Structure 1
Amino acid sequence: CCTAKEDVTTLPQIYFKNGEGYDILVPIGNAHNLISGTEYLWEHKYYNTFTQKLGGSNPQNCTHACNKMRGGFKQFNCTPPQVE
């Protein structure tokens, strides 16, 4: 079941240095991080955070986690302090 698939379409593509050259790099999301972050920051009540529902109004499209956890995946609120 666990194999590979490659579609850089719609996928951010950034350069990152290899030390003496560059390496064009595609950042994709982590599945363990998303579901584990939702469960843990809900069960230890972390509230300086966001909520994002992946898929839109039909969350059966993206993944199976999307389809089940339709309440919304939780993202960290990475807002810095503001002066004055």
Structure 2
Amino acid sequence: MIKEMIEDFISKGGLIFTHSGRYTNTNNSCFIFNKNDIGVDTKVDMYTPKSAGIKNEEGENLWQVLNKANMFYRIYSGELGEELQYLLKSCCTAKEDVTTLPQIYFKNGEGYDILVPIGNAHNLISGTEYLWEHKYYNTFTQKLGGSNPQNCTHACNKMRGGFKQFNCTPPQVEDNYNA
């Protein structure tokens, strides 16, 4: 109903994050939480060791709980109490590490700036969900992990549809003609 998932997530080593470099290198363990991304229609991601989770005896899945009625936001308003929000947020501790990340130098008027580009999971989720309903077979696909990909994320495990990559190939100039 309300608690059991919450205490199951807390007792086991669960963590919430939105930007991570694991899609580039699996060896990194840097996780940070950003303030700006809180919103009604922003997507998040979670990690637990062994990627076990729990299974309902009646039969339930992780995806459905996020988008049914938004119960945790419905309690966020303060109808039932304010204690549980702090209870949940207290487990979100961020770690910093830059090893095995690219460095890019960028020019800003007079001077330099060093940057480390990172990806967003919400972009992937939105793109896949919006393209999966229009029957647009104009993308590549790729699976992470490799030999043992089920221990990395549930994305390779459960939804076999595949990720969507934009085809940025421009047309070529046909030779032996004016154009």
Q: Same fold (TM over 0.5)?
A: yes
Residues 8-54 of structure 1 show CA distances to partners (whole Å, capped at 9, x for unaligned) of 33322211223222211111211101122112111122222111212
Larger Rg over CA atoms: 2
Deviation at 1:66, TM superposition (A): 4.0
How many residue pairs are counted as aligned between the two chains?
Answer: 84
Take 2:112 and 2:143, find their aligned partners in 1: how far apart are those partners? Answer: 34
Moved more, 4-13 or 49-58: 4-13
Taking structure 1 as the reference length, the TM-score comes to 0.73
Take 1:5 and 1:67, find their aligned partners in 2: how far apart are those partners? Answer: 27
Percent of pairs identical after alignment? 100
Deviation at 1:81, TM superposition (A): 0.7
8 Å CA contact 1:50–1:75 kept in 2: the answer is yes
Inter-CA distance 4–54: structure 2 relative to 1 (3 Å threshold): same
Inter-CA distance 77–65: structure 2 relative to 1 (3 Å threshold): same
- For the aligned residues, what is the CA RMSD? 2.3
Inter-CA distance 56–10: structure 2 relative to 1 (3 Å threshold): farther
